[PDB]
Amino acid sequence: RQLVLHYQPKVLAPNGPMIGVEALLRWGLITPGQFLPLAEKTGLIVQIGEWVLDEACRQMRLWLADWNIAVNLSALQFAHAGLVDSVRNALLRHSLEPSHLILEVTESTAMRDADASLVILEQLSAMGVGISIDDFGTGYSSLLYLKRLPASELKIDRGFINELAHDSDDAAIVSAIVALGRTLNLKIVAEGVETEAQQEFLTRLGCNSLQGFLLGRPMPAEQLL
Amino acid sequence: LQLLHDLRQALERRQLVLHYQPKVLAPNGPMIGVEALLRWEHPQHGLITPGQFLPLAEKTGLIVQIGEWVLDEACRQMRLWLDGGHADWNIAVNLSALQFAHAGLVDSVRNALLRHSLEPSHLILEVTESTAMRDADASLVILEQLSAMGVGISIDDFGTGYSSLLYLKRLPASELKIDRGFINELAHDSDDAAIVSAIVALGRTLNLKIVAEGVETEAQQEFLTRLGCNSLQGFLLGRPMPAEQLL
Ligand SMILES: Nc1nc2c(ncn2[C@@H]2O[C@@H]3COP(=O)(O)O[C@H]4[C@@H](O)[C@H](n5cnc6c(=O)[nH]c(N)nc65)O[C@@H]4COP(=O)(O)O[C@H]3[C@H]2O)c(=O)[nH]1
Ligand SMILES: Nc1nc2c(ncn2[C@@H]2O[C@@H]3COP(=O)(O)O[C@H]4[C@@H](O)[C@H](n5cnc6c(=O)[nH]c(N)nc65)O[C@@H]4COP(=O)(O)O[C@H]3[C@H]2O)c(=O)[nH]1
Ligand SMILES: [Mg+2]
Ligand SMILES: [Mg+2]
Ligand SMILES: [Mg+2]
Ligand SMILES: [Mg+2]
């Protein structure tokens, strides 16, 4: 068992309290960018995912701790026939309210076969699980399906969060995502917040919550305290 | 289902209208505003009341655009009235639980006031006790924004939910509205008069105006006045009616 979760805080804007964490997988000390693609191609991602989901639910129970936890799903995990049985079973196993668990799938993953995403996410949403669309702005979305999917939040891609000059293309895109949130009834999370000016500007643009190194780096449950 | 199809097209068919009910200083003092109340003029069923279709609207999400239309028309009407010289009237608009939690609520209020050049102090937003107290920390963030814009905040159907006195003081509410259920039962239950008195006393000690709602009889009016209610609303003082008929 060399697999460990690190947790990164999500924080209500403007400076408001921490409302939850994202679980981030780690393995020397190996980062997931170095091995998740091999796991995806080989199918080992599905067992690793079962372990991640279980450990996140276990940790949340242990804490419960007035907050929720977000787990990432790769394209294979999202499409895997077992996914929805397994989410329901993991919440049942730990007697954990479904409102405490968030599942993140990327824009690309969700939009690849939107009708199939809809069958899967509708089940998940009827069970009460929070559904987040990650890396938003980096894929291709149908506005029609963006409304139809029972998502509760979009997470702005880290790639748009750099110098964020007021007249930048990046700022326009952040504004557009915020406006999608406002018109489609979705919370918007900015990810990759490293500086005070980003925090301030993203808050004024109307992001609902923030994640990034400035607010807290990923760390193991113990160090998080 | 017929109701579902019919409600979907109700805005397209201009079948939705606002009626307005006077709120009056107690006992019968000047009218200080109105509550906007949605009605549906149905070509087959006639004038349908919102208890008969707002739950379907909530469940389907049709309540969002129905609410945009309600807010727009209410703001239009208040503007018109202000320009007609009714300087001391406000208008109160109801918010369901879904509208109160909608990510765009505050932007939509700001846009509607700007569209009709309406000072924010002439708009009152009513959220029920239950709605406000379900997640009080979240209610606080929402209501503080609305209150900083200058919009009045009313806690509706008061007495029907469960309130934290702590958050009841922290919320930037301006008024509590006693639920009509407590007014109607006064002649038929000894507990109701105590409950109504307690609500009035909460207003007095937390610095909130109290509105008594559902006033139908002279004796209710007299009793509520003697208790010290600030304002009254009810059939005795004036039923909901269209803006024109109200005059
Ligand atoms: N430069 C910078 N980076 C920041 C900042 N704040 C957070 N990050 C990093 O950005 C990534 C956020 O996760 P992601 O976009 O979902 O993207 C994740 C996610 O797609 C994938 N991944 C991580 N854990 C899991 C997992 O348990 N399951 C699955 N299926 N995928 C995972 O690996 C990707 C990269 O993971 P990480 O290395 O942990 O990198 C994490 C996080 O450490 C910041 O302020 N500045
Ligand atoms: N028996 C009796 N009833 C009286 C008397 N005085 C006032 N009422 C009624 O009490 C209700 C007061 O509104 P509410 O408690 O906010 O309760 C409202 C409110 O929750 C909701 N509603 C109405 N319009 C709207 C709207 O535009 N948006 C939203 N979200 N909800 C609305 O529907 C509920 C019922 O609306 P209405 O049928 O118009 O019923 C109205 C009004 O007609 C009286 O003396 N006797
Ligand atoms: Mg993620
Ligand atoms: Mg991301
Ligand atoms: Mg009301
Ligand atoms: Mg009421």
Ligand 2 pocket: which of B71, B94, B96, B239 to mutate (most atoms within 8 A of CB): B94
Residues in a beta bridge with A189: A155, A209
- Cα A19 to ligand 3 centre (Å): 15
Looking at the complex, does the CB of residue A181 fall below 8 Å from at least one CB of chain B?
A: yes
Which residue lies with its CA nearest to atom 31 of ligand 1? A72
Tokens of A14: 């403007």
Residues in a beta bridge with A102: A70, A130
The single-letter code of the amino acid at A47 is Q
Count of Cβ atoms closer than 10 Å to residue B96 Cβ: 20
Looking at the complex, does the CB of residue B104 fall below 8 Å from at least one CB of chain A?
A: yes
Looking at the complex, does the CB of residue A125 fall below 8 Å from at least one CB of chain B?
A: no
CB within 8 Å: A185 and B103? yes
CB within 8 Å: B102 and A208? no
CA distances from A129 to A100, A135, A148, B65, B230 (A): 7, 19, 16, 26, 45
CA distances from B166 to A150, B51, B133, B206 (A): 35, 32, 11, 10
DSSP labels, A17-54:
-EEEEEEEEE-----GGGTHHHHHHHSTHHHHHHHHHH
- CATH number at A183 reads 3.20.20.450
- Which DSSP letter does residue B94 get? E
Q: Where are the beta strands (DSSP E) in A83-180?
A: 101-106, 130-136, 153-156
Residues 33-72 of chain B with CB under 8 A from chain A are 64
Tokens of A215: 């607010």
If we measure between CA atoms, which residue out of B177, B181, B109 comes closest to residue B143?
B109
What whole-number distance in Å separates Cα of residue A87 and Cα of residue B123?
45
If we measure between CA atoms, which residue out of B3, B93, B73, B1 comes closest to residue B42?
B3
Considering its fold, how many domains does chain B have in total?
1
Per the CB < 8 A criterion, the answer to whether A112 and A73 are in contact is no
What whole-number distance in Å separates Cα of residue A204 and Cα of residue A55?
36
Approach to solving: X-ray
- Torsion on CA atoms B147, B157, A152, A130, rounded to nearest 10: 130
What whole-number distance in Å separates Cα of residue B246 and Cα of residue B15?
20
CA distances from A187 to A108, A218, B148, B239 (A): 19, 22, 22, 40
What whole-number distance in Å separates Cα of residue B18 and Cα of residue B71?
10
- Cα B37 to ligand 2 centre (Å): 6
Question: Which residue, among B107, B140, B144, would best test binding to A if mutated, counting the most A CBs under 10 Å from its CB?
Answer: B107
Resolution in A: 2.3
What whole-number distance in Å separates Cα of residue A59 and Cα of residue A217?
18
What whole-number distance in Å separates Cα of residue A136 and Cα of residue B195?
51
All residues of chain B having their beta carbon less than 8 Å from the beta carbon of residue A12 are: 141
Q: How many CA atoms lie within 13 A of A99 on its CB side?
A: 5
By CB neighbour count within 10 A (0-12 exposed, 13-18 middle, 19+ buried), where does A124 fall? buried
Q: How many CA atoms lie within 13 A of B185 on its CB side?
A: 14
What phi and psi, each to the nearest 5 degrees, are found at residue A155?
A: -115, 110
- Residues in contact with ligand 1 (CB, 6 Å cut-off): A 8, 23-25, 31-33, 36, 52, 72-74, 77, 104, 134-135, 158, 192-194, 211-213, 218
What whole-number distance in Å separates Cα of residue B149 and Cα of residue B105?
13
What whole-number distance in Å separates Cα of residue B129 and Cα of residue B162?
7
If we measure between CA atoms, which residue out of B170, B141, B111, B108 comes closest to residue A208?
B141
CB within 8 Å: B103 and A16? no
All residues of chain B having their beta carbon less than 8 Å from the beta carbon of residue A66 are: none
What whole-number distance in Å separates Cα of residue A77 and Cα of residue A85?
12
B94 lines ligand 2 (CB under 6 A): yes
Nearest CA in chain B to A208: B103
All residues of chain B having their beta carbon less than 8 Å from the beta carbon of residue A187 are: 103
Nearest CA in chain A to B106: A182
What whole-number distance in Å separates Cα of residue B102 and Cα of residue B11?
20
H or E stretch covering A112: helix A107-112
All residues of chain B having their beta carbon less than 8 Å from the beta carbon of residue A208 are: 103
Tokens of A108: 């690309």
What whole-number distance in Å separates Cα of residue A13 and Cα of residue B25?
41
Which residue lies with its CA nearest to atom 4 of ligand 2? B214
Looking at the complex, does the CB of residue B177 fall below 8 Å from at least one CB of chain A?
A: no
